[PDB]
């Protein structure tokens, strides 16, 4: 019974960590974009449209 | 002792809408400012509830299936309804659960009683007439507690039989509405669990007669049926259920 519980909880933890990694990749892309905007719009004037 | 009642007037049973009543606390767990979703035997929102009348001449004490559960509501004045009879065959063949409330206290017994075809009590204008049973042979469980009890008192009761436990939920609501069920929300707090562990498939309500022949006291009660479904219960900061949602009523509530 404890082995069944361990498999279930380990699967839940792995699912959480995997979706956290995917969300972290998305947030890292967003933060790289934010750093680029900080550099090019705040520290300079950008000719890039929109 | 049994007495036939041959002065009734024929009348088909009525129906009315349950409105927003029948919600009870699923368990003994406190929750504060949390919306909880649970799956338990509940009385559905806006469903027809069978309506019985008792007015001078009407006297409605039939035998109805228990099914998976019963919601009992009673617009009660002058304390006409006194108890409930629980069992399957309502004779000496099987065992029955008796819930009564006489002038002193409530008695909860599990015995094999002999039930009359017409069980009722009697009020003399003082209570001096008990004709509901004729024998009591084999008892297995007896329990005594404190009594639970224009329309001025509204009583709601929910009865369940799960895993041999008998759960009684109740809530005393003061209203002033004349005929039908009022509109509002009131969660039914659990009162007492009876570890009876017996088979129950039928039930019967117990009334009281008036002597001045017999006169029917003015009363009206309702009997609903519990259906297993999912509810979304709202708990306020004080921990009581203030509003609920039936997840299978209409798409907005879903």
């Amino acid at each position: 019974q404890i082995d069944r519980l361990i498999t279930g909880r380990l699967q839940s933890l792995q699912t959480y960590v995997t979706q956290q990694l995917i969300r972290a990749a998305e947030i890292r892309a967003s933060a790289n974009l934010a750093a680029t905007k900080m550099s090019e719009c705040v520290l300079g004037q950008s000719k890039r449209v929109d | 002792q049994c007495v036939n009642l041959t002065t009734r007037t024929q009348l088909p049973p009525a129906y009315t809408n349950s409105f927003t009543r029948g919600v009870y606390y699923p368990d003994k767990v406190f929750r504060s400012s949390v919306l909880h979703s649970t799956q338990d035997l509940f009385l559905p929102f806006f469903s027809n509830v069978t309506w019985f009348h008792a007015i001078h001449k009407r006297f409605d004490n039939p035998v109805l299936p228990f099914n998976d559960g019963v919601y009992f509501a009673s617009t009660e004045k002058s304390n006409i309804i006194r108890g409930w009879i629980f069992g399957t065959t309502l004779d000496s063949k099987t065992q029955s659960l008796l819930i009564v409330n006489n002038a002193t206290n409530v008695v909860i017994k599990v015995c094999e009683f002999q039930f009359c075809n017409d069980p009722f009590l009697g009020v003399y204008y003082m209570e001096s007439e008990f004709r509901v049973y004729s024998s009591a042979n084999n008892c297995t469980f007896e329990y005594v507690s404190q009594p639970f009890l224009n329309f001025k008192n509204l009583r709601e009761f929910v009865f369940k039989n799960i895993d041999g436990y008998f759960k009684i939920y109740s809530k005393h609501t003061p209203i002033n509405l004349v005929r039908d069920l009022p509109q509002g929300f009131s969660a039914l707090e659990p009162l007492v669990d009876l570890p009876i562990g017996i088979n129950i498939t039928r039930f019967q309500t117990l009334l009281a007669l008036h002597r001045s022949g017999w006169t029917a006291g003015a009363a009206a009660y309702y009997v609903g049926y519990l259906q297993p479904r999912t509810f979304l219960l709202k708990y306020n900061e004080n921990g009581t259920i203030t509003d609920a949602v039936d997840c299978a009523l209409d798409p907005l509530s879903e």
Binding site: I6, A31, A34, V42, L43 | -
Partner: protein
Amino acid sequence: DSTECSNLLLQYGSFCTQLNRALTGIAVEQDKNTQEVFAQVKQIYKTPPIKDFGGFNFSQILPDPSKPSKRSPIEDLLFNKVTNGLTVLPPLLTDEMIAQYTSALLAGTITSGWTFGAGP
């Protein structure tokens, strides 16, 4: 706190080490993200005490000295409008530090244009 459960969990090897390592990687990546976005200047710039910018009014975006948090009114509004073995690690940069970065960036762009982003 179950000893038997931990003994059984020892059969699965280093799964917990992998999960903790991945979460630690995410946690340090968040601080790195904040550093790349906000720590773009090594100089903490300040606006002059007199706010004579040729009629241009930056009060809504410059820090409010009256507030304890030293946040701009727009920043204050932004912070007001956003509301079992589990631990939450605090970020490396506090909100005051990030606000001080934003204040330095604002002072640099107001008083020196784009020149501070390419040199002195």
